[PDB]
Every structure is written in structure tokens, then in C-alpha cells.
Amino acid sequence: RLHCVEWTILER
Amino acid sequence: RLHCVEWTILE
Amino acid sequence: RLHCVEWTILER
Amino acid sequence: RLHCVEWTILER
Amino acid sequence: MFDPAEKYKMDHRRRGIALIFNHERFFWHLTLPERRGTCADRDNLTRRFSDLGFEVKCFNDLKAEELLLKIHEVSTVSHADADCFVCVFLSHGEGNHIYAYDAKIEIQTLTGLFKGDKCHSLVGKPKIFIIQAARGNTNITEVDAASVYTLPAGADFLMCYSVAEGYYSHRETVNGSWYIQDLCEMLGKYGSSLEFTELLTLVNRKVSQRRVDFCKDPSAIGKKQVPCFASMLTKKLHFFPKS
Amino acid sequence: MFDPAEKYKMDHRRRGIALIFNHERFFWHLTLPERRGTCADRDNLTRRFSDLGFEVKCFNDLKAEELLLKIHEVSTVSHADADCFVCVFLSHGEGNHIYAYDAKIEIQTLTGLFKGDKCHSLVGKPKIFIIQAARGNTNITEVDAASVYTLPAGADFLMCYSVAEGYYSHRETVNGSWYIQDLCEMLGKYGSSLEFTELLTLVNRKVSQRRVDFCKDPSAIGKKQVPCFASMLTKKLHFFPKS
Amino acid sequence: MFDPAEKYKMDHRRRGIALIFNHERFFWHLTLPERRGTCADRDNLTRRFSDLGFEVKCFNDLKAEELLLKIHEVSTVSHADADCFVCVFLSHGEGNHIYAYDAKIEIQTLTGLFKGDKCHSLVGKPKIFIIQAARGNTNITEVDAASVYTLPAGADFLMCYSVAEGYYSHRETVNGSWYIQDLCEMLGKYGSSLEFTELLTLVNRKVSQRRVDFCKDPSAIGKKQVPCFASMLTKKLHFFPKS
Amino acid sequence: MFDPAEKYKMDHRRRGIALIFNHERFFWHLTLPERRGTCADRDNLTRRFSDLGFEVKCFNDLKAEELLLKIHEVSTVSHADADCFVCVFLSHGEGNHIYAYDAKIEIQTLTGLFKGDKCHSLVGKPKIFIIQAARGNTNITEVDAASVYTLPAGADFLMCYSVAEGYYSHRETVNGSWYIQDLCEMLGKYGSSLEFTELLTLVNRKVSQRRVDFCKDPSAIGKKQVPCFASMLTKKLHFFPKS
């Protein structure tokens, strides 16, 4: 299935 | 808020 | 014991 | 002309 | 014994699927410019591949997640009675990454789904990926720098790239991308006759010979575009019309 | 205006130069394993290219210094009366680089020497580089992993690679590399007739068909080899007999 | 107007928050080995920082997004009430990245949350990150090679590393990590008296002087551990007891 | 057993050697800009360290070959009757590489000449490297972006860096680098009394306080400079005047 390899923290 | 910037497929 | 690890070509 | 862009020194 | 003229058996009852992923705009956080004209490319490619017998499927501005699910579905459905597989990517890209609406995906992740082991109905069958993708900065000609690495994908894979490193991609806001335009013209005239790699070589010449006026841009004079293709095909590929 | 049958003009009084840089062993501190069988490759290539009309120039275990000087010489000489250029690298490699006896050179500085700006007499003429290079570990089969980026080089450049990423190169200590063997067999039989990229596609099939299933060295069972070529040619390429 | 002995005001009502991220096992696909004995480190760290007046907050095996989400909260609450901030990472790591249960997180995006602009209420206050992280392969001593780059982050930041490049980290399965053990022992005795960097220097010595016994393991002779710390602090740091 | 007060034995007949490698201009093809004001930095350091009792040796614009030869000598000489060793680099740098006049050298290769098996007479003694290195873009202030990775080197190594990643180095064409100036002022006032890392922490404060928001070069409003040191020392370090 789907997998995130990198997360960011959004500004808005 | 959180947000993936790169997705892949496993299995 | 001196040793270049990478060479390049130049002009002038 | 030739040019080594990086030099190291070895311990033979 | 051995056939220097040997070709992919293209006598399956269907030609196959043509997967087109069209991306004209992006998530604000990616700070990626719009791609006006990409719809013209989509429509062009659609008809040229339909005429070649493909079952074309266009998806517009999908997010990474929906895109992956959708291509994984095509990868897992049977291609047993098909000749080959075609997947096209129209979007921004960088290094090994293409962009879906909201995130980047690795090309190897997309191509990997159709490799011998993972896709069985496509084994020994031509798998063709066409990538119009570069770095983001009335008719207008926009110029983008080559950014996507032009690599192969595996056995019986044909990787086609709009632009090679050190050159620049071009896209007209109305007519569309130089690469796509020239590819679709060659497809229309010679698509159902010429050997596909030789047809791509034609596209190499047509795009490499293109010029801007230098009358509408001072900021693009001398930026040439030369496409390329990485072949791991093992036989001749033709799209002669089917019965 | 446009002729799909268009072809590289191959009627100059010389076919051109085929440079072969052969590399068997390396400066101790690089800790690079020997490439036994590379000589069999070198001599195999020397004949097949001579029979095609090339002036073959082989060089063995040159140090980066000599190599650069030599290749720079060849790039500065007039090729006005030549059909094309051929350069062959038999060595270890990594990413964007190849290894000379004592040091590492960026392949782009090697190809860059023959670009339109730097080499006018080869403009519009085919520039073919053949790379048998990977990462090092009685006739014995040795198995290296792909290490060199299979990238193109520029307009009218044809880049040929022994193996692609995720695949393994093979070389027999007596008979030579799988890639070079097959390439040389196809050169001998079809070189003087087949279009070159279609001959290369044959090599793709032959190599990809070499079984790695019943190995005496079970370490390497299922380590398949698939070659590839990145093409930025703009015309058909034949090496028909001259005169 | 210059004081060579100037100290961080540790006046505030609260000492501050001590965040600890304990990682014991990992996502099957990351194929990373367990880190037995990490819970001992967690508890050891918990007791010693509580005794120094910290509001200790522990989290075990949080997924990348859980972890990010949690640390982001701690960066967006007020610390105007406190002396400083502490964050501990007990996991595997590589280069610039540390491992959350299922994904890699860039250290710089973890420290960045607490820089002077994103976290006004810590401007001028010590921000201390402690990292026990390396590359994986009764009481057993496991040996792991340094992997995490020993980088710094920002003004008034203090990055403390269990081991530097070319050295090996050690973790007993019951007593925990050498670095942690030694750090916690120095904290117990000298934490509330010694200048904090001087104390870490004590840890440098204590760990570096640790040997093994030739017979505990055949594959661990002469794999010394040398921790380090990258200081960006602008004053002296003491943890004298608060009233 | 353990003594928190423990200190480096600094009563040898000599303090030790302070090497300084000063680089103002470079080989043309490197296209690295002049570092005007580095001579001010060089002479300021020379005497400050002389006052601390060091035998200062300055070398100006050496080539990679001469530099490696010279620094290998210093490392091969006996340091048994010396307190410690100091090595200073004033030049341009990138990642793991510092620039000598005509080429680049890995910093690890330099530091590595003074580690315990390679330099016995320095084992247990402070090895201090000071690096003023960044990326190239009437007293004028020039601003360079951080380039050189701020890593450690080994046991009892103290690596001192003018600027940290994401910050900017500053050098005035007459007065010299912000870092070197402040370091020298601190060395002059507190060198002979303060524990060295606490003196370096002073320099951190002083440089990070140098305002950058009201320039007369509008191209650098906001570009803060924050230095750092990575310590692998195991004892307190004082440069008390020798008797």
C-alpha cells in the first residue's frame, strides 16, 4: 500500500 | 499541519 | 606518497 | 594542460 | 536460428493501455509554476495513441496517492491479451522525481510496478514510458531547464525523455510542448509503419532543429532542445494496424 | 522537406577512429579488483571495428594523466575526412565517473571533448561511446553490480552501456564480458548491414537471455544482465562497406 | 559591558520540557534491527532530568508523522515560563536523518522548529538536543558503527552526540547504552553543579576510556567509542537547583 | 577513581606548534574570489598564539602538494615535549574539502595525520583545528555562505568553525574576518586564564551579536553569523602562562 517516505510541516 | 512530500508503494 | 585522486583537462 | 583537482597523501 | 529481424509479437487482440497523467497546476506549497499547454499535449497524445489502437486513459492533476493507486490498478490487471503498455507523464520533475499535484514520486517506483516479476502479462512485452517533465522557473513559448535524469527502467522498457541534461525543454501555451508536438506529428504520419525507436530518432531530429524567433524572447536565444531515449528493448517494435 | 529515410553521411574517405581504453589492474590504494578477461574483450573489439573500417587505437592501463592527454589529442585532430568517432571504455566505474589506472575521471569531461563547440569536424557526425564498466567485488565467470549512471552525452551522441542499474555485469576470465562478446558477435554478422541501434537491440536480447539459473557459483543465481543504450542520434546509422 | 563568565538566566519558574523519543523496533520494510536496552536508557534519562527539574515527556515508537506532530506542538506552546528546552533521540539514524518507527526524519527539520524565529519564547535560551543513534547490523553488548552526522543547528543550540565518525556506539541489552549510562551517571553526581559542557566533556572521557574484555566478543576488540558535542551556546550553562 | 577537575597536563617545556595556512588568492581556473583581509587574520592569530607560547608557523598560498608535504612533516616530528598542537586554516572550502592554492584537500586527511596511531607524541594531548572557510560569492565587509561541514575529527580533537550551516561568514578587507577578530580579542584578554571551550563560547556570543540589519551593503541585511565548535576533548583545557 501507500507509504510516506518524507513528511513536512506546512505553513498554511 | 502535516503533509507527505514523497510517496511510494510497498508490499 | 603524494597522490592526485582526480584529474581534469583545462585550456589556458 | 592537465590539472589534479584534488590531492591526498598516502601512507604507502 | 537467430533472427536479426525479430520483432515483438503484436498480434494480441488488444494493443494495450495508454496511461496519460496530465498535470497543469500544483499544490501551493510546492511553488511550482503552472504548465499552460499541457492539455493540448494531453489531447494530442490521446488521439495519436487511440489511432494506434491504444485504449487511452487520461487523469488530470491527480494527487500522489490517487495516482499511485490508479497506476497500481493498471499494473495488477491482466495485459495477457494486449501487445504492450504505454504510460505518459506530463508534469514538473527533478532528478529521479516526478511531481503529482501535491507530492513527488520516484519514476523507478512507477516503472517498478510493470517489471517482469511484478507484472506478468507484460513480460516479453514492450513497456513504454514517455516523460515530458522539467524544472519550473495569446501564444507564448516557455523555456524550462532539463532536470529529470534520463535513465532506463528494465528489460523490455523504453524510456523516452523530452529533454537531455544541459538542454532546455520548451512548451507553447496554446500549441503545447515541442517534444510532444513533434512526437505526435511523427506518430500521425509514420506511427503505424516505422520502427518505434527509429520514429523517436526522427523526433530527436525535429526537436533538435527547432528555433524560437529571438523576436519574442531575448531571454531564450540559443537554448536548444534535444530529447533522448533509453532503450532496453530486445526486439523490433512496430504498430502496424490490427485486424 | 522532411525525410524519415534520412541517414548519416558515411561516404568520407575514412570511417574514423575507434579508441579503446583497456584496464586490467589498478593502483593498489584504489583497492579495485582485477578485470581478467578484459584483454579478450579488447582484441575482440579491435577486429570487429577494424573490419568495419575503423582505425583502432588501443591503450592499456593508462594513468588518468596520459589518458586525458591522449583523448584530448584525438579530439583536437581533424575528423573532417572521417565518418564518425568511436570510444570504448573497459574498466571499473562509479556514478558519473570511470577509473583510469590511478584515478577517476568524470565521463562528461571525456565526452565533452567531442562536442560541437570543442570538435567542429565531428559536428553532425555520430559519436559513439561504448562502456563496459561496473563495481568490482581456468575460465571463471565474475559478477559485478551496475555502478555507472547510464546517461546520454549530447546531440548526435550514442551512449552504449553493458548493464543497467539493478542488474549485474558478467565477465569470463577467458572469453571476456558477456556484453562485449555478444556485441562483437553481432558486429561480425550484422555490423555491415543492420542499422546500429537495431544491432544494439539484438545485443540487448542476447545478453538478457544468458541464463543465470544453473550456476556453478550459486552466489550469482538470478543475477540477470540487461544492457541499454541512450540515444541522441538524429539520423539512421549504417556501417555499410566503403568504396 | 562584557562578562567572560556570563550565564544563561536559569531564573524562570520552570526548568523547561525534556522531550524523549524512544525507539525500540521498526517498520518491517525499513529492515532495521531492534535496539534492546533502549528502555533502560529512556528510564535512566527520565529520572536524571526530572531530578534536574525538567518536565519529562516520553514517547515510544512514534511514527514519523506522529513524532513530527508531537514535537511541532511542543514548539508552538510557550516556553517563556522556562529556562530551556531538551530533546532526546534514541533510535537508528543515517547521515542527516534519524529514524521514526516507519520513516526517516531530517534532524535539521526537527531542530528548525525551535530556532529563534519559529519559537520566540526560547530566543536566548539553551536548546539542547541529545542523540543516541547509530547504524544497526542476560546482558549483551551490541556494537554499531557511527552513522549520524555530528552536526550543529542554531544559535544557543547544543547538539550532543553518542559517537563520532569512524567510531562505534555500544548498547548493553539490560543496562543500556554506554553514552547514555555515562551521561546519566555524570548527571546524577554533577548535573546540578557543573557547567553543562564541562560535564559532557566528562562524558567524553568516561566513554572513551571504556574498553571491553577480550572474551566477551571476538568481533568487538578495538572498536572504541568517542562521543562528541557541537556547541552553539553563547553563555555558561548550569543546572543549579531551583527554589 | 574519577576526577571532574581533571585537566590536560600543560607543563611540558614547550607549548607546541601553531600551524597557520593562509590563502588569499587561488588558481585562475578555480574561479575562487580573493580573500582580502586574510593577512590581517593571519598576523593577528600569529601573535596571540605566540603570547600563549606557541611556535607559530605561517604558510602563504601553498599548493595542495606543498601543503600536504609540510603538514605531514609537522605530524611526523616529535611532540613529546609539547603541551598540544594547533592548526589553522584560512581559505575557501566546500563540504568535506578545504582549498589550497591550486586544488582541494579533504580536511579529514589533514586532521587524520594527528590521530593516535599516526602521531604517538600527541596522544592524550589537545589537538585544536581552527577553520575560517566559506564559499566564494578602503574597508569593505564581504559576506560568504557557510560551506564546510562542521564535523569532529577524533579523540582529544577540538574543531573550531567560523560559521555554521545556514549562516554567513563575514570578512572586512582591512580588519579581517569577524570570527578571527573576536577570537583574537578573546585570546588576548582571556586566553591565559579561561578554559578554552568557555573562551570559544565567548566568541560565539560576540560574533552572533555582530549586527547585520543596518549595513551599507544592502545585499546582506539579515545574514547572521553564528560560529560553533565540535569538541572531542576529555579534560579541561587552560593556557596558563608557562613558568
UniProtKB/Swiss-Prot annotation, chains E, F, G, H:
UniProt-listed InterPro entries: Caspase-like_dom_sf, Caspase_cys_AS, Caspase_his_AS, Pept_C14, Pept_C14_caspase, Pept_C14_p10, Pept_C14_p20, Pept_C14A
Gene Ontology biological process terms in this record: activation of innate immune response; apoptotic process; cellular response to staurosporine; epithelial cell differentiation; hepatocyte apoptotic process; intrinsic apoptotic signaling pathway by p53 class mediator; positive regulation of apoptotic process; positive regulation of necroptotic process
PTM per Swiss-Prot/TrEMBL: Phosphorylated by NUAK1; phosphorylation inhibits self-activation. Phosphorylation at Ser-208 by AMP-activated protein kinase (PRKAA1 or PRKAA2) inhibits autocleavage, preventing caspase activation, thereby preventing hepatocyte apoptosis. Palmitoylation by ZDHHC17 blocks dimerization and subsequent activation, leading to inhibit the cysteine protease activity.
Location of Phosphoserine modifications: S50, S208
Activation and inhibition: During activation, the N-terminal disordered prodomain is removed by cleavage. Concomitantly, double cleavage gives rise to a large 18-kDa and a small 11-kDa subunit. The two large and two small subunits then assemble to form the active CASP6 complex. Can be cleaved and activated by different caspases, depending on the context. Cleaved and activated by caspase-8 (CASP8) and subsequently by caspase-3 (CASP3).
Tagged with keyword Lipid biosynthesis: no
Catalyzed reactions per annotation: Strict requirement for Asp at position P1 and has a preferred cleavage sequence of Val-Glu-His-Asp-|-
Residue positions of covalent lipid attachment, annotated as S-palmitoyl cysteine: C215, C228
Region ranges (Tri-arginine exosite): 13-15
EC number: 3.4.22.59
Effect on the protein upon substituting S208A: Abolished phosphorylation, leading to caspase-6 activation
A Pfam family matched in the record: Peptidase_C14
Region called 130's region, residue ranges: 96-113
Subunit text: Heterotetramer that consists of two anti-parallel arranged heterodimers, each one formed by a 18 kDa (p18) and a 11 kDa (p11) subunits. Interacts with BIRC6/bruce. Interacts with RIPK3.
Function: Cysteine protease that plays essential roles in programmed cell death, axonal degeneration, development and innate immunity. Acts as a non-canonical executioner caspase during apoptosis: localizes in the nucleus and cleaves the nuclear structural protein NUMA1 and lamin A/LMNA thereby inducing nuclear shrinkage and fragmentation. Lamin-A/LMNA cleavage is required for chromatin condensation and nuclear disassembly during apoptotic execution. (Microbial infection) Proteolytically cleaves the N protein of coronaviruses such as MERS-CoV and SARS-CoV. The cleavage of MERS-CoV N-protein leads to two fragments and modulates coronavirus replication by regulating IFN signaling. The two fragments produced by the cleavage interact with IRF3 inhibiting its nuclear translocation after activation and reduce the expression of IFNB and IFN-stimulated genes. The same mechanism seems to be used by other coronaviruses such as SARS-CoV and SARS-CoV-2 to enhance their replication.
Name of the protein in its database record: Caspase-6
Source species of the chain: Homo sapiens (Human)
Taxonomic lineage: Eukaryota, Metazoa, Chordata, Craniata, Vertebrata
